[PDB]
Amino acid sequence: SLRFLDLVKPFVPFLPEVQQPESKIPFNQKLMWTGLTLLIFLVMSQMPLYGIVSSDSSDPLYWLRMMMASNRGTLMELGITPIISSGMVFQLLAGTHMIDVNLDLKSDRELYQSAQKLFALILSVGTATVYVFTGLYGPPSELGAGIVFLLILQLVLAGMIVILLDELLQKGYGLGSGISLFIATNICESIMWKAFSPTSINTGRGPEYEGAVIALFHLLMTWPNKQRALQEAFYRQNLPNIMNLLATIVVFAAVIYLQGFRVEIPVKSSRQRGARGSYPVRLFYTSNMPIMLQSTLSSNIFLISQMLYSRFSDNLLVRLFGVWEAKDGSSQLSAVSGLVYYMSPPLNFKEALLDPIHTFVYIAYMLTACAIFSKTWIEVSGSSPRDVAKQLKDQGLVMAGHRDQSMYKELKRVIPTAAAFGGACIGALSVASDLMGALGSGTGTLLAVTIIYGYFEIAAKE
């Protein structure tokens, strides 16, 4: 809700902030800083935590950590959930005028930015406390009060470092944003680890390798029966395989093809004869933004559901809202019934075939929520048809044979339809990809492709 003007005001001097670049950073240095932030993010994502009594307790974000750039048992356990949560919340509130913000003032913008970073910090600290008290690495009783505060310190300062790295990237020292950069990094690293992991585990046959391509090599190189070797390598359950590789490749091609879609509005420079050109309106007008917004909302809802179930599962409200069960063969909880179950994705194609009504409800929720998120996002950000017409007028672009009002009418025809239907199509592609089962999440592959395209468009400019 709105404050007087803001409540953060006393906190402002206490918050650290990276200095904006005093001069235009050259593109070589932009790439340098981006790569350095890449390396530190990877190191933190792989460097394990402390106090780990055991890594076998239920994780409330099992299906969303790789999607939100988090790895269990490492410094990147926080991911960027506080970042996107604070962002989305503040941006939506400011764009719909729930809060008394006046973004024309630079001081007001500074207060708004400080509130965003501060709220991200509170979100980090709160989810860290929830994690340690729910005991993702051993129960607090076995941990002890001397080590839980240590764990809180590591998680807090790791989230703080992530906040500063994202701020570093966003303020012009690097390319794009830390959110998208880290998400794409995690997805790509996880996917080719599943493709080429040299580690081995003891299955019923013996030591067998994790990577699909390595298994494809070894099975053919050690089995005289080529047909049996291929039968294992292609369809081995509970391990990555060439069928998942095919799913990844085909979803990559499909998302690239669909991303290539855009409607070409014929425009013209008003100060030069001829010079006809086109303004593109992509089918994925918001790119992966609706998916990211939905993923953050779902992560928050899932966390609150799992944390409520640990203390109030007896009550009828909690189970009507969502039911978690620890299915056989694993301690990981999963949604079985309730609204959270219907809003949760199905496990696979065959499993989705086992519940037509649940799949229908989830698909409807996906399409509707993604379309609504995109439609609200284009108006929250400066990308409504009004803003697009303003930008075109500022650039001095016109439509031949039309007035600026006709340009705006055409933009009203195209842009909202583009946003809504592209959000729906990205939801449908996410559903199909997760159904078809890539190495990582099919939605993860979609996110990786879209973020790579966005950074390519940034790189292209410079």
Partner: peptide
């Protein structure tokens, strides 16, 4: 077996297409 049928169709199409492409590119010269 439906999976075996899918595997055989994929293998036939995949390997025949690679063979045809490599043919037209390099072996067509000979």
């Amino acid at each position: 077996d439906p999976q075996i049928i899918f595997l055989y169709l994929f293998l036939t199409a995949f390997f025949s297409g690679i063979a045809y492409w490599v043919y037209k590119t390099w072996l067509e010269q000979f």
